[PDB]
Amino acid sequence: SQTLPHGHMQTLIFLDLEATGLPSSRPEVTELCLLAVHRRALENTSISQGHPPPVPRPPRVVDKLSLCIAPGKACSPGASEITGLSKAELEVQGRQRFDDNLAILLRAFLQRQPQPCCLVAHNGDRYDFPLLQTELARLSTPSPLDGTFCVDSIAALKALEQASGSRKSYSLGSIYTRLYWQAPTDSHTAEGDVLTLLSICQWKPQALLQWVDEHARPFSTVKPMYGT
Amino acid sequence: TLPHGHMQTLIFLDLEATGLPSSRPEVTELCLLAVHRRALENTSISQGHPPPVPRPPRVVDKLSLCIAPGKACSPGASEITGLSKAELEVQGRQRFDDNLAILLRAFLQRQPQPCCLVAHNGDRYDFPLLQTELARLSTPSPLDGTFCVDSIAALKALEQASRKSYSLGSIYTRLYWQAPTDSHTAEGDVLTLLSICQWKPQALLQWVDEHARPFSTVKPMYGT
Ligand SMILES: O=c1ccn([C@@H]2O[C@H](COP(=O)(O)O)[C@@H](O)[C@H]2O)c(=O)[nH]1
């Protein structure tokens, strides 16, 4: 008689973004990647066996969107160094700002995915989700995420590693190296970090899906990082 | 004097589908990788033997989608692409439909113009098939102001001097003297194509500028 809050998630959308700086700087998004995987494709992953297990093979059927976005303010020195992006370079390559057409693009990508759909992002609750909420709030469209759910993979992997704890880092790279005994690739790029996150979430797919189903919350409840 | 000016965006494109042209095939996967002209011009020039495989530019836009066809894949198609109608359906993929055109239009709108599609064998397969799929929709085609070229012709010109296979894999191994290691997916084929096109990036861009033609002139593979 105990039931899930929002049903079984049929799509997980792994999400990462890069931005101009840390939250108190009121940052703007400079890169976004979404990787949509159906529940069945995740639970089709070969069981992890051995120590270390091989890095899981990404499912054959996936949908991917990766975009670079011109910010309205400069990247901090540290942000440009870590991410490899700068306002100057995004402008010389004619990247457009975060605008209504981008919301329309995002909505049409999300609409191709079976519902219910859940965003999954590492530190999403403190960074990616509030910042995306802020960017979308500036636009004239409805939120393209208004019927989409979300979860933070830090909590998920803390739970999953407990089932298999203190001053163990739950950074993306730390987890990946603990699970697979190799370093990740293309760190601090939106698509590279989404692919690393997919690999971590393919470690124990059934357990990950159960945790996500139980912890998914509506994206519409995410408080913006900062306001107009 | 170029026919349509300097191309500001190259969009590397690959389509996978249910079969060969006489079967009246339907698209099962599409990948677009949009690269600004300056990002290609910034590719390092090795001038060594062998040249290292270029790495992709930092700034790229990418779209990869799986699409449910209305007809089954041939056995050959499923073997080569790793896709099937049944599996695409069980994973809830949608057809090539109006919402997909909204998505393609919005993605294209984020690229500086003029924009040129680049596809390996695109003149005989990918471009006519895409034309057919878009023609079935109510929406006017999002590609009617876009240009296109076939990268088989490009690499024939870039390798000519002033027997060779022009399969994607053969070209990559001939240029880089190592085997490709991208996945057998639409995105894998696009990444291999990008690497080939980064072998001589200024020369590739010059050939594309000289040979770009309007996508509106591509004849559909087949008609309703
Ligand atoms: O030392 C740091 C670490 C992270 N960030 C910001 O954190 C964003 C997202 O973090 P990540 O996805 O690269 O881990 C980055 O785009 C960047 O703007 C910094 O500015 N300085």
Q: Which residues pair with B149 in a beta bridge?
A: B118
Chain B residues with CB-CB distance to A under 8 A?
8-9, 36, 38-39, 58-66, 82-83, 87-88, 90-94, 99-100, 102-103, 106-107, 109-112, 185, 187
Residue A18 Cβ < 6 Å to ligand 1: yes
What is the Cα–Cα distance from A170 to A157, expressed in whole angstroms? 8
Q: For residue B107, what is the nearest residue in chain A, using CA coordinates?
A: A105
Which among B111, B172, B170, B125 is positioned nearest to B30, based on CA atoms?
Answer: B125
**Is residue B126 part of an annotated ligand binding site?**
no
Q: With the C-alpha atoms ordered A160, A165, A169, A175, is the resulting torsion angle positive or negative?
A: negative
Kindly give the pairing relationship between strand B9-17 and strand B61-66.
unpaired
Q: Measured over all CA atoms, what is the biggest interatomic distance in chain A, rounded to whole angstroms?
A: 58
Q: What is the DSSP letter of B123?
A: I
Which residues lie closer than 8 Å to B199 by C-beta, 6 or more apart? B51, B54, B158, B175, B176
Residue B62 class from Cβ within 10 Å (0-12 exposed, 13-18 middle, 19+ buried)?
buried
Ordered strands of the A117-121 beta sheet: A217-218, A149-152, A117-121, A11-19, A29-38, A63-68, B61-66, B27-36, B9-17, B115-119, B147-150, B213-214
Domains and CATH numbers, chain B: 9-217 (3.30.420.10)
Contact B27, B16 (CB under 8 A): yes
Cross-chain CB nearest to A66 (options B62, B99, B100): B62
Nearest to A71 by CA among A56, A88, A47: A88
- Whether A122 sits among the annotated catalytic residues: the reply is no
The answer to whether the beta carbons of residues B186 and B15 sit under 8 Å apart is: yes
- The reported resolution of this PDB entry, expressed in Å, is 1.6
Q: Rounded CA gap, A104 and A101, in Å?
A: 5
- Candidates A174, A122, A182, A111; CA nearest to A148 is A111
Mutate: best of A11, A33, A61, A110, partner B, most B CBs <10 A: A61
Q: How far apart are CA A76 and CA A30, in angstroms?
A: 12
